[PDB]
Amino acid sequence: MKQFTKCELSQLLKDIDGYGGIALPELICTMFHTSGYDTQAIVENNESTEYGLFQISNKLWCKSSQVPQSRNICDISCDKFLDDDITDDIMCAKKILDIKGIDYWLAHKALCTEKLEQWLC
């Protein structure tokens, strides 16, 4: 259920290259192994769930019925991360990068800090 090509995502996110010292291919890499470019991706964990192209968690970042105690850092309902517009998802991902850095994503150190030429367009 890929909803983007690696190339279209690289073009849409072109100005996020360098953001907090992030290389763009590093990020695209991270997004692919995270969500498979599926804007509707839902990953269910123990106490919580991660949503969308960026797999943003309801534990901290958005408001959801599942975690009423969430601080909702991005000030947004998690449902917004399952629509076809990734603009709000990108806003939140940047807030994550501003705080916690690219290591929020467990795919980044696992696969995206080494051998990245396949993520170029």
Among residues 17 and 88, whose Cβ is nearest to Ca ion?
88
Q: Residues 74, 59: contact at Cβ < 8 Å?
A: no
Q: Residues 64, 86: contact at Cβ < 8 Å?
A: no
Q: What's phi and psi for 99, nearest 5 deg?
A: -100, -70
Among residues 79 and 110, whose Cβ is nearest to Ca ion?
79
Q: Give binding residues as ranges.
A: 39-40, 50, 80, 82-85, 88-89, 117
Applying CB under 5 A, the residues found at the interface with Ca ion are 80, 83, 85, 88-89
* Residue 15 C-beta: closest distance to Ca ion, Å: 18
Q: Residues 92, 62: contact at Cβ < 8 Å?
A: yes
* Residue 34 C-beta: closest distance to Ca ion, Å: 15
* Residue 53 C-beta: closest distance to Ca ion, Å: 8
Q: What's phi and psi for 105, nearest 5 deg?
A: -90, 125
